[PDB]
Design an enzyme around this catalytic site. Structure first.
Site, PDB file in Angstrom:
ATOM      1  CD  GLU A 166      -3.225  -0.515   0.022  1.00 30.35           C
ATOM      2  OE1 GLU A 166      -3.185   0.575  -0.553  1.00 30.35           O
ATOM      3  OE2 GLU A 166      -4.091  -1.356  -0.224  1.00 30.35           O
TER       4      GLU A 166
ATOM      5  CG  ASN B  16      -8.241   7.719  -5.323  1.00 30.01           C
ATOM      6  OD1 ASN B  16      -7.381   7.021  -5.850  1.00 30.01           O
ATOM      7  ND2 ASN B  16      -8.392   7.652  -4.017  1.00 30.01           N
TER       8      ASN B  16
ATOM      9  CG  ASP C 255     -13.303   9.156  -5.688  1.00 33.71           C
ATOM     10  OD1 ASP C 255     -12.126   9.463  -5.512  1.00 33.71           O
ATOM     11  OD2 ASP C 255     -13.856   8.332  -4.975  1.00 33.71           O
TER      12      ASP C 255
ATOM     13  CB  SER D 159     -11.727  10.031  -2.230  1.00 37.03           C
ATOM     14  OG  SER D 159     -11.210   8.963  -3.024  1.00 37.03           O
TER      15      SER D 159
ATOM     16  CG  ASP E 102      -6.424   6.176  -1.391  1.00 39.18           C
ATOM     17  OD1 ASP E 102      -7.594   6.231  -1.012  1.00 39.18           O
ATOM     18  OD2 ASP E 102      -6.102   5.684  -2.471  1.00 39.18           O
TER      19      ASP E 102
ATOM     20  CG  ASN F 141     -11.044   6.762  -0.122  1.00 41.45           C
ATOM     21  OD1 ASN F 141     -12.211   7.114   0.023  1.00 41.45           O
ATOM     22  ND2 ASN F 141     -10.362   7.159  -1.181  1.00 41.45           N
TER      23      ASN F 141
END
Length: 130
Positions: free
Chosen positions: A36, A47, A49, A51, A53, A60
């Site tokens: 990760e 991202n 959208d 959002s 991380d 997220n």
């Protein structure tokens, strides 16, 4: 925000009770953090959208933490996302415990699913003297 060592992180996560949390042995959690974030507590990924991380376990901002800039953050872990970029993994580990308890196990992490699930996860704690 620091890059942890493998055994360093395995020791911290062991201390925080992740070993066999919800049936997942420690090597699962160490493998998942390797893929990760490459053990980097300061990693962020944005991202399509809107959002982002955050941190060592790429948590997220639409579901789990609130950063102020994300469309309809549920803030399910009740934390600001900046808390997840600290060198101290405590906020990340406690929110990861809500995420693995959400009903889909460690499959909430795409990296664990792709890179860890179904491999030999025992190797990730070998040599650590835990």
């Amino acid at each position: 925000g620091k890059v942890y060592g493998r055994c360093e992180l395995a020791a911290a996560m062991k201390r925080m009770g992740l070993d066999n949390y919800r049936g997942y042995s420690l090597g699962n959690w160490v493998c998942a953090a390797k893929f990760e974030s490459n053990f980097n507590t300061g990693a962020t990924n944005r991202n399509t959208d809107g959002s982002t991380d955050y941190g060592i376990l790429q948590i997220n901002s639409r579901w789990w933490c609130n950063d102020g800039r994300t469309p309809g953050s549920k803030n399910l872990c009740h934390i600001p996302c900046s808390a997840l970029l600290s060198s101290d993994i405590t906020a990340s580990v406690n929110c990861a415990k809500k995420i693995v308890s959400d009903g889909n196990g460690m499959n909430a992490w795409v990296a664990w699913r792709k890179h860890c699930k179904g491999t030999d996860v025992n190797v990730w704690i070998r040599g650590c003297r835990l």
